[PDB]
Symmetry: C2
Subunit: 300 residues, 2 copies
């Protein structure tokens, strides 16, 4: 059949992307209805970025200070309100390309597509995961700020992410659409570490199911284990522990492959302890934790 | 900065995708202007798929035999002509969503985005490479046939690929838009091997430049080599040989990193011969040959 990393089609979102300007700085904004959502740090200079008093910095801004472009067309900002770390700009015009949408806050391990932009024009799409330490491994250059992550269900767009900053370590932190940072991060220029990151156990499992489906299987073993004895080897190898909820999530996959979750665990535990001695699995030489159980189904 | 595999935004194409039906079988079609392009095997049963006499099979089909849907809307087929392995269906209506486009035949090693569909409705997008043996590693289920590969330059869509079949080995073969198979393949149900596949040398290089840009570098060594002595170790490890054209292609990257192509080669040669002894490079434990030099630039 085949199995690769795969993003939701980006169209529906592409028609919500707008450029937002305020002084020197310009960045990407999400135009839904007669609101335009963007990162609030748009209203900062460099001076301000070391220690911004944002409430102070707003209010001293009038609507006309905010430029919004939708192609070669100008929205007029008629109101402006801040919501945590998002600026929201009410405009005179509703977006005729608004899809059915909602705002969700995702959970660590959940995936989404990112449409990454520069100057309110889409450059590219890729699929991502919300790491345990609330960071994301992606690609984001200058001007990429305000690029969003989403999922599509039937034809409802669930916005989950807005990009804000690149942490020294080369990875990206951002907010949901209500303006709250995933992780303990703050929009200011000061050296912020995400903690040590761990692997998304339940996903790696689902990867091993996918593998077995598309016909790989060398890594399967004789053994089985308890969920506890397993976990005790999980924690040792920077894997997130595995709940019963997680086991439940793997029930369908388990049922299809005729392989019990705790056996899969035993086969995984073994890989952790012996490595892959030069072998590959779905032609990767690493354990892929960025496919959720749900992702694997939909593709399969 | 960051570096991940990244597809062109799919919108522009999503509005060219149509469902095409003929008897039992239904598949994806590309609607540009008042033509709709699709794989010709749509006109086959299973019987016919063992050894199809396509010229025979057409002509005995009238226009009304061809159903085309564009959302919940019906195009009327008013002419039908075959071009090698594509059926082309003239319709009463031009596609108001046709973008600026062209048809290109790509070369092995060139990349493109695939928008993969089922029943003329887009399910997902991913980035791909035209392997040396003219196959592609992708994801394509039943009904995925007629899913296209493309590149965008500014706002011109260069169609390069149409999907036809999955070869036993789990990989996918298809045509350009003029209906000619990349590779020595034919649209019939008979066991066809692609030859042994090799690695895209020039791309792997560009990957090593990207790496060095985003700050990795452990794999750099003291040595240098000749292009010949290099090649003689390339051929041994299933790498495509490296022309002067390829060296020329890496000139810009070389100039940025302050690292001469033949030194990079020496550093690569060394990896080939010693492996990666547990290390990673841009967090992959393999050599990534599916980013062209051009791709790396645009992202960077």
């Amino acid at each position: 059949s085949g199995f690769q990393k795969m993003a939701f089609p980006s169209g529906k979102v592409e028609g919500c992307m707008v450029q937002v300007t305020c002084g020197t700085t310009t960045l990407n904004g999400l135009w839904l209805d007669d609101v335009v959502y963007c990162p609030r740090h748009v209203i900062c200079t460099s001076e301000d970025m070391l220690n911004p008093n944002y409430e102070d910095l707003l209010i001293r801004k009038s609507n006309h200070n905010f430029l919004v472009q939708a192609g070669n067309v100008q929205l007029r900002v008629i109101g402006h309100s801040m919501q945590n770390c998002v600026l929201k700009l009410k405009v005179d015009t509703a977006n005729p390309k608004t899809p059915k949408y909602k705002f969700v806050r995702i959970q660590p391990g959940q995936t989404f597509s990112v449409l990454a932009c520069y100057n309110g024009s889409p450059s590219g799409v890729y699929q991502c995961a919300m790491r345990p330490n609330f960071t994301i491994k992606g690609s984001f250059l200058n001007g990429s700020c305000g690029s969003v992550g989403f999922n599509i269900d039937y034809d409802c767009v669930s916005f989950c992410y807005m990009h804000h900053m690149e942490l020294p370590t080369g990875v990206h932190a951002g907010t949901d659409l209500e303006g709250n940072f995933y992780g303990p991060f703050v929009d200011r220029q000061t050296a912020q570490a995400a903690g040590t990151d761990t692997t998304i156990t339940v996903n790696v499992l689902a990867w091993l199911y996918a593998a077995v489906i598309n016909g790989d299987r060398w890594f399967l073993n004789r053994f089985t284990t308890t969920l506890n004895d397993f976990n005790l080897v999980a924690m040792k190898y920077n894997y997130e522990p595995l709940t019963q909820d997680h086991v439940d999530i793997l029930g369908p996959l388990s049922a299809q492959t005729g392989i019990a979750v705790l056996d899969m665990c035993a086969s995984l535990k073994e890989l952790l302890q012996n490595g892959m001695n030069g072998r590959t699995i779905l032609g990767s030489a690493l354990l892929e934790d960025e496919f959720t159980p749900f992702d694997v189904v939909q593709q399969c």
